[PDB]
Design a protein around this nucleic acid. Structure first.
Ligand SMILES: [Mg+2]
Ligand SMILES: [Zn+2]
Lengths: 130, 353, 133, 38
RNA sequence: CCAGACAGCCAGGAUGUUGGCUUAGAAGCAGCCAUCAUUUAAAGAAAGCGUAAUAGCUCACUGGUCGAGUCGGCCUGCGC
């Protein structure tokens, strides 16, 4: 629509990063709304409605909102990516459920980059606080 | 609760009568069969026979579940009434009254759909009484039959008015045409088409020899006299030719194939206008001939059935009333001739004759 | 080949209504009927839908689910039809407490964690039905 | 091809085209829409 | 509209739900009425095709790729 709602969307993105800087990734190269339905039903079972999949990863939407916080996502941006903001607990299991979704057929698109919250590599981190 | 007991008994009796007239088990048999060939899937590989199967399936299943739920309603209302008599639960008794009324109204809708199945049944009717070839005895019988039918119409609530009444010089009326107006009048009175057989000790005869006279009641609905639509320019063929200027106009209706010529006037427009009025006149004439031909075909069929027109027999000598078609009998001749034919017309209408 | 095609659990062997619609495939009519009847666990007389994933070995997998909210609104109202001109004349009325009771009974399989949101979805279904809360 | 004096798009896949000074519309969706200004 | 626009190109287009009735069947798509909620990137109780109805094929819509203009209304001259 308009640059006005774009501004509230950008402010919302920055605010969601600030309130929960925990993050994970997913990509819909071949995935079904029933798959997103299972993910967001379990998400609403875990916690509130605030679960946002913010797939606005253009090189000047997400990268333009990036220099506030977690500046490493500028190179992450310009490809098909859907971020996900998280409060609960340091390094929660939502990266792990995105991994099991990668097992159950998102056809290896997100490539589990991990959003470097502990500034880690592209590989898995099974060491999470449980 | 005594009207409730009598009312449940009346519903049980009329449900049994309805089952006997409807032949429930036979229709259930065709219902089960239609269900079976519906289950084999070739029936939807043929379109139109599946259309017919859907129609007959819906009708049979609706009648079957209606009669079944009335059986269940009769038994459970009877049981809960037995509860309500002794336990005296007033709210549950009121529930019994409500569900009993619902069951009665729904079976009433079923028998309603059966008895008023005609397309013209809702409209008002012209009902005619005509005496036979007998004489003054048949005249008197036609007149008092007209009295009885007026009494029945007033008892039902139908509004009556005598359109025409040709009387006899001695007594009685020879013929009479009556407009019976009101809802469902033709449906209520459509079983009366036919012949009544009077047997009584005739008073007009000098010796008191009994007479066997006849009368007919013929009922037909007030059909709408539809407007006669004008003809189309494409449906007409317009030619002009020299009269014997080419002012002569030959108008030809092509889909039927009828021509009219006009050549007497110098004005081609006048010739065409007279030809167009001739077109309209012949079209009206042909529509009337088609209607009369269809009426004659229906008369051929009902003259073929012939003797079946003798529907009712009043033996006033032995005091018995008989419907031959349903075969029903009674002895209260004075009540019958007063106009208490409700039992007979209901029997005939559930028979479907 | 997963399309739900089912009738109320009370009437076993749906030979008139569905029939060939459940039986285009090589899976047997009797197998479908016994799978549907295997119904006896909770209640009968009410439609219970099921997802039918049919494989090549004709050993289909079936996942049953909760009865429809439409006929549940019918059982809550106690009425039969409530759709014919509801705006011109209101036909019925359902309590919001009854709707929330319906929602908390339907919270098992209905896709949603917010019970009030599922509730207000249900009176959305109820206004579409015609009955006004 | 239908020859009309008022040719226009009827459905969403219909395309105006001008060939030899004649306005046609062509339809990749339904050949019934194929029509010509004349 | 360089908070990347239009057209292409890769993806989704769901949940209650098949919203009910009347039909014979009514599932977005025969008619009538209401036209919500959830997940929210977005999905209309559906714009079209289609089914005997389902099924199935698109669309609106929104995500990804690309990187300079886009789109259709008004007035008006000359033309077809
Ligand atoms: Mg010109
Ligand atoms: Zn076209």
């Amino acid at each position: 629509a308009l640059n006005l709602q774009d501004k509230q969307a950008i402010v919302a993105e920055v605010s969601e990063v600030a309130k929960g800087a925990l993050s994970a990734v997913v990509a819909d190269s071949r995935g079904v709304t029933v798959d997103k339905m299972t993910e967001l039903r379990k998400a609403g079972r875990e916690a509130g409605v605030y679960m946002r999949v913010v797939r606005n990863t253009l090189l000047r939407r997400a990268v333009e909102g990036t220099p506030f916080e977690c500046l490493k996502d500028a190179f992450v941006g310009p490809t098909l990516i859907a971020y996900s903001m998280e409060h609960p607990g340091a390094a929660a299991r939502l990266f792990k459920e995105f991994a099991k979704a990668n097992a159950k057929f998102e056809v290896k698109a997100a490539a589990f980059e991990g959003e470097l919250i502990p500034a880690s590599q592209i590989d898995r981190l099974a060491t999470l606080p449980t | 609760i005594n009207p409730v007991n009598n009312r449940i008994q009346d519903l049980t009796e009329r449900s049994d009568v309805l089952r006997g007239y409807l032949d429930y088990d036979a229709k259930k048999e065709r219902l089960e069969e239609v269900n079976a060939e519906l289950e084999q899937p070739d029936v939807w590989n043929e379109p139109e026979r599946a259309q017919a199967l859907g129609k007959e399936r819906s009708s049979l299943e609706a009648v079957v579940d209606t009669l079944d739920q009335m059986k269940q309603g009769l038994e459970d209302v009877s049981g809960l009434l037995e509860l309500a008599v002794e336990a005296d639960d007033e709210e549950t008794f009121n529930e019994a009254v409500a569900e009993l009324d619902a069951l009665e109204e729904k079976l009433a809708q079923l028998e309603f759909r059966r008895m008023f199945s005609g397309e013209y049944d809702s409209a008002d009717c012209y009902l005619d009484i005509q005496a036979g070839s007998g004489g003054t005895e048949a005249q008197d019988w036609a007149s008092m039959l007209e009295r009885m039918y007026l009494r029945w119409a007033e008892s039902r609530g139908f509004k009556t008015e005598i359109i025409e009444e040709s009387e006899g010089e001695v007594a009685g009326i020879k013929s009479v045409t009556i407009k019976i107006s009101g809802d469902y009048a033709y449906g209520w009175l459509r079983t009366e088409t036919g012949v009544h057989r009077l047997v009584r000790k005739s008073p007009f005869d000098s010796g008191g020899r009994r007479h066997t006279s006849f009368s007919s009641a013929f009922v037909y609905p007030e059909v709408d006299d539809d407007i006669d639509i004008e003809i189309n320019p494409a449906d007409l063929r317009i030619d002009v030719y020299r009269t014997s200027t080419e002012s002569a106009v030959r108008i030809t209706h092509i889909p039927t194939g009828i021509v009219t010529q006009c050549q007497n006037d110098r004005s081609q427009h006048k010739n065409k206008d007279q030809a167009m009025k001739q077109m309209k006149a012949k079209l009206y004439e042909l529509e009337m001939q088609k209607k009369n031909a269809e009426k004659q075909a229906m008369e051929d069929n009902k003259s073929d059935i012939g003797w079946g027109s003798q529907i009712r027999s009043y033996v006033l000598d032995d005091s018995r009333i008989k419907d031959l078609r349903t075969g029903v009998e009674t002895r209260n001749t004075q009540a019958v001739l007063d106009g208490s034919l409700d039992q007979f017309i209901e029997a005939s209408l559930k028979a479907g004759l | 080949a997963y399309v739900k095609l089912q009738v109320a659990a009370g009437m076993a062997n749906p030979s008139p209504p569905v029939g060939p619609a459940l039986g285009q495939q090589g899976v047997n009519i009797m197998e479908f009927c016994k799978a549907f009847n295997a119904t006896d666990s909770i209640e009968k007389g009410l439609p219970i839908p099921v997802v039918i994933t049919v494989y090549a070995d004709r050993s289909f997998t079936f996942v049953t689910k909760t009865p429809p909210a439409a006929v549940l609104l019918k059982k809550a109202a106690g009425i039969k039809s409530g759709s014919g001109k509801p705006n011109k004349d209101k036909v019925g009325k359902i309590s919001r407490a009854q709707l929330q009771e319906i929602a908390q009974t339907k919270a098992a399989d209905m896709t949603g964690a917010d019970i009030e949101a599922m509730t207000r979805s249900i009176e959305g279904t109820a206004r579409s039905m015609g009955l006004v809360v | 091809m239908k020859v009309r004096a008022s040719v226009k798009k009827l459905c969403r896949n219909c395309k105006i085209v001008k060939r030899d000074g004649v306005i046609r519309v062509i339809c990749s969706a339904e050949p019934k829409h194929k029509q010509r200004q004349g």
